[PDB]
Amino acid sequence: AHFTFQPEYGQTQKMNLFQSVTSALDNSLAKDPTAVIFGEDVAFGGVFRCTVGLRDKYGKDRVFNTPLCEQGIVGFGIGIAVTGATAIAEIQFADYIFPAFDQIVNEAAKYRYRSGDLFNCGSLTIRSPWGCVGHGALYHSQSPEAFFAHCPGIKVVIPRSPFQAKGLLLSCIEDKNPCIFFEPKILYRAAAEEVPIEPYNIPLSQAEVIQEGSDVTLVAWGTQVHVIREVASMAKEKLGVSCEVIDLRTIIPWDVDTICKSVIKTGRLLISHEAPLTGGFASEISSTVQEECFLNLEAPISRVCGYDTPFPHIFEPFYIPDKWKCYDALRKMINY
Amino acid sequence: AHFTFQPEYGQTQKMNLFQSVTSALDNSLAKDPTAVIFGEDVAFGGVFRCTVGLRDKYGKDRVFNTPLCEQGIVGFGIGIAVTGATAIAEIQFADYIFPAFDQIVNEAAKYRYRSGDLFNCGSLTIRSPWGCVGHGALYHSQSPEAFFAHCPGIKVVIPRSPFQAKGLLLSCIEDKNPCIFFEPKILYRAAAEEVPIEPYNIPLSQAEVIQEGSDVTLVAWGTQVHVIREVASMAKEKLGVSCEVIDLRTIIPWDVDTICKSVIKTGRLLISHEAPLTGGFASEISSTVQEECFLNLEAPISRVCGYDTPFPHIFEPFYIPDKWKCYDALRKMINY
Amino acid sequence: KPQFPGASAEFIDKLEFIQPNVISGIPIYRVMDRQGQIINPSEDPHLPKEKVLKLYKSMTLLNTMDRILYESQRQGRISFYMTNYGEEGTHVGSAAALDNTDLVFGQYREAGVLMYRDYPLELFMAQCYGNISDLGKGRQMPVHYGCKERHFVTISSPLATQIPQAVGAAYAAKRANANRVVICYFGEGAASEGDAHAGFNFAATLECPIIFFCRNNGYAISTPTSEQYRGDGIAARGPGYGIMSIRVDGNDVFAVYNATKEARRRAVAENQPFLIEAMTYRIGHHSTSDDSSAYRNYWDKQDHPISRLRHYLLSQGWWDEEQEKAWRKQSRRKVMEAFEQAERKPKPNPNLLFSDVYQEMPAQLRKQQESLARHLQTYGEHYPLDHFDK
Amino acid sequence: KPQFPGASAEFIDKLEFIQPNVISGIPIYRVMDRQGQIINPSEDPHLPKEKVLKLYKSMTLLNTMDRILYESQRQGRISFYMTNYGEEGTHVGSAAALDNTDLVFGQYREAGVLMYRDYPLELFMAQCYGNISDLGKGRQMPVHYGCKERHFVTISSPLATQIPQAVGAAYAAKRANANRVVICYFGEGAASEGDAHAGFNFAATLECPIIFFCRNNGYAISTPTSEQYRGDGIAARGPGYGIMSIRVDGNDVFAVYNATKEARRRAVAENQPFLIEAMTYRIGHHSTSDDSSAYRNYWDKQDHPISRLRHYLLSQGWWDEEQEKAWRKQSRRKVMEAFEQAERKPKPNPNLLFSDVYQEMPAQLRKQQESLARHLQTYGEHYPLDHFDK
């Protein structure tokens, strides 16, 4: 593996990330009698086991399979939500969210605005496996968040761990705006830690500083947070460099203030993500930070991203923005 | 109107922008017997008259209406192009390109890569009306280029005038990669100038410096080029400030070198576009320029863009990044 | 004998392709002839006088409003308009067969359903003018109506997107034990979209109480149906998805009513979808941006839903020329009163461009709103401020 | 008498919904029984011995390769695999009825069509291994085969996208006066996508020489057809679009052949689409990532296409146990020879991650390629370099 995972609220149990998602969905159906979960192959527990046991517990009318049609899954979910009921739609891989792009962008995101708040689909959440998995190639590896970041009216949220995933998913489910929640699939079984059994929330539009530091700010989300945590360790050890490590968590609306506050302190910023460089979300963070922290910047902001190609099968190890690529970019930024 | 249009290759005639598109399409069908043009309502000449006379001239098998289904128009066009024939698909408003987003992003863009160049759809061009029109509201005003900019394998091209539109459209048609050509519809009748009757090309991935200047670089595309040309005039007159005015022309792959060369000279950059700020293409230009021209930048790079909302009907005059908004941002950037 | 999971069928030992019946398609259900005469007494719904008068008055008040607003657009007073000419019977015949609280999703050419549900003239005109009375806050193009109080979901321009949405709202109603049906209107061009195939199939497999109502008016802008499909219209598609289907004369308000009323009764009882294809003809231009003579009446003069209904009223002794003349004057007056009021109202405060993007206003969007306010403070003489509230 | 542009039909004066016939659906065309016996002599294609032996050998060489590659995946030697068990008759019966140069679009479970067209074992295995011999340059997941020389368009994972693409390639062939047909294979789950409705309707209205071939194998991963649709399968959808349609026993190579051969003849002659739904049963897991016992044989033991074909060969005197034993050994040897070669080949140069994104390589993408090369110069000890060419 290219990463290493490392691990107030009542009793906890050790959960991997798929189990934390099941736990969030179970808590939601238990407390909200209107909530349903639907999509391809969810009834038997899903292709990644995220819905195991829920149809038996809550009933076939609340956890059910749809026909194989993503534009329909999202349009159907908007309509459930227009009536006020919680609709938790699954899209089987984020790579297959594109047939539903018109329903997300032209419809879900715009529903409240265009009606003057006469109608809305706030009670819709779309959850989808995301990011690279070692051998997923072009259509089981994608990270589509920058496509959605350019659409006002939706929220886009990505967790880095089991504890984070349950708390952020419950916040998505309960938020009054249509939300896309992307689950890093390479963590579904790998990442396991203590997770509260009872429901809890983590706020949206709020980054988390997971390690304080004074020389450079590193920003990432999803599995790539674990990559930059290791990069921070490598920098301390090899270079005597103190890195502030930040998980962005929500892509939009994003926490501009936490990132700028960090860069005002450190003077230096590196952003990293698996998605391609050009048009990726690091470009929005980099310009904004340049706009707000111009006087504090000691070096150009660095973006260490996937290359501008489709996601390859056999060349995956050469494609991803791994710890060596991030480390080397950091070293040059420190030397600048 | 919020803008003013201002106006080697053999005989020319005065053409507005819809007529320049017809002229490009006529020249293409004349010299390429494989070429066809299809989409909703193209047979009678189209809802914006871009195909008037072409079915009578070239035949009903070459200029024809499809059923009302954009995912089908694009998938059909990819298949024509897989056989080597030129396929010129129309999408009736860019706002309705989203049903075809999966065919563009997961299929057209990836077709050559994923087959090892055994198959391709290089001979596909998709042309679509684009940008604000005074009263188009949410679904007849959109500028979707930043959605496509994050997709390696397609080219995205936007002209500012009749002369530019014919030369860039012929380059799109003849390029060996799937291309999206966005036609600013507010210029279809408004902008008229001399246009060569016979075919000619303008290169893709090449910006044009339309006015040299020494104090600030201004970058835009489509109708917004005319806005920043006026802003340049306002700055010279009111502030004694010399602006270099650049039309980007191709969104991807974009001309990084021309923009950086200009900013190395001027020290200051303002980018403007109608599309929403967050995730818009100005963010890619701003970070890249910061990365390449860090030492030359005297002030933060400015982005003057549409607000992060859907495109409104009655509030259009308050929404667009007009000459006063760009001028004011420039004035502050000069004062910095 | 065949054992395959995917179909229930017998074997056949000879090769035989199944041919579509397109020349002799699904017949068109009719109740009254073009002279307003009931053809088959067993099919007469015998609707009471006051209700048949409401069908008629709704159609003609809509027609009066369409004529005035089309003119207003031609003068540049509103930015866009779409008329309902020729299709007024499909709207009122169907709406009269619904429960008041049944949820409606539409396309854009169904304003008679809101008129039947007593949507105020002031609110149709507020939306077209984008004025302070518009509950849509001036944000959408004209004719993009919506009303939460009358269960009419806001119209949006992207075609067919409401089809799978309507199915989800119907699934939710089933769960809620609502005893409510959802109706979803769309045209024949919209039915070519992938979202129509999504909604039809989901409604059948998830067993939803929804009526799909297709207005087949022969054209989708410039495209005749011969370039839209090659099967027997939209009705012949329903059975393929396992949907009970019917085709009606959409210029016969009673055929439309009967089919809708029976579809509603069975959809709610049985939790199953129904499809009605109402055959009609688009008398108007597609919109104010269309000059339809560029690509194409008998219909206006010889088969019009309003004329057919007027002849029925006369046959019962329920209308006459004196009444016709009085109502024409009163309807023009009511429409002109609302029109004048709408034109004199200001537009909403420009701050409303920023609300309702999300339920709350994110801090970075508030920053943009503040930036506009600062901008207008310095440069406001360059903006149409005196037309906007506050 | 009705005058409406959108349909050709008579009036009806009584209200009658059209009911779908789902319990008695479109019958399943059969030629030979489960014991390899011809049921109706008039339907026997009387294919010559060498061709029937090629159908049989193709199916069993595919089956041999599937068993070995599935095992290779379980061991971690390739990253993914999908078998063809139970569906081998649909692939070879159809491919044998095509012209060699007819263009094929598929889904991922049609490898027998390439095997029939003599695609080399070395190239199936190069693609699954991502090695230097793969003309796909190692870029896609295993089983995403393509061959320009044998007119088999590269497979892609997104379901149904090839359906409207195949229609466009068929329109182009019509224009080119090709005398060629396009065939487009997809499963019953894929047929629920909006792109299937797009392709079916376009092929009918634009009059394209295309066969739509649906493998209905009862499941789409875990989803049974009862949750996929509620009409009479996929065949009953065709006539709604004006497409000539048929349902066949997909475990009968001769029924599949006859239907494909006649559909090809008529599609090319008439420029009209045909739809064949082949009823079959997915014997394998969906893929190596699926354990199908989590959601569900008679089929493997009592109705298998390979067994049925083997019984036919015996009846003609065209096969025996000695031949069976020899071919089983020879096919295992051929597959094992290619397997060993594939495992020993290196992977392609990592530079190939950057080519063919566009035809040319844009300067900014070259800059990225150079950046990788610099990176590997310093940090290459941290990468699996000794496995990659150059």
Ligand SMILES: Cc1ncc(C[n+]2c([C-](O)c3ccccc3)sc(CCOP(=O)(O)OP(=O)(O)O)c2C)c(N)n1
């Ligand atoms: C997804 C998509 N694609 C294209 C359009 C453009 N457009 C429309 C479009 O631009 C539009 C829609 C609403 C208001 C203003 C403009 S309408 C239309 C033709 C629809 O034909 P129909 O379904 O038969 O109904 P009608 O009652 O009018 O006969 C088209 C093509 C569209 N609105 N949405």
Ligand SMILES: Cc1ncc(C[n+]2c([C-](O)c3ccccc3)sc(CCOP(=O)(O)OP(=O)(O)O)c2C)c(N)n1
């Ligand atoms: C647009 C989209 N949505 C979902 C998937 C996931 N996926 C698939 C997917 O992830 C996949 C596809 C190819 C290789 C590896 C993985 S396959 C599938 C089930 C298709 O059922 P079918 O059409 O009846 O064919 P079969 O012969 O297998 O019975 C699904 C659901 C998909 N590939 N594309």
Ligand SMILES: [Cl-]
């Ligand atoms: Cl996976």
Ligand SMILES: [Cl-]
């Ligand atoms: Cl317009």
Ligand SMILES: [Cl-]
């Ligand atoms: Cl002015």
Ligand SMILES: [Cl-]
């Ligand atoms: Cl290592």
Ligand SMILES: [K+]
């Ligand atoms: K939500």
Ligand SMILES: [K+]
């Ligand atoms: K091209």
Ligand SMILES: [K+]
């Ligand atoms: K709509």
Ligand SMILES: [K+]
């Ligand atoms: K595909």
Ligand SMILES: [Mn+2]
């Ligand atoms: Mn129509």
Ligand SMILES: [Mn+2]
């Ligand atoms: Mn299947």
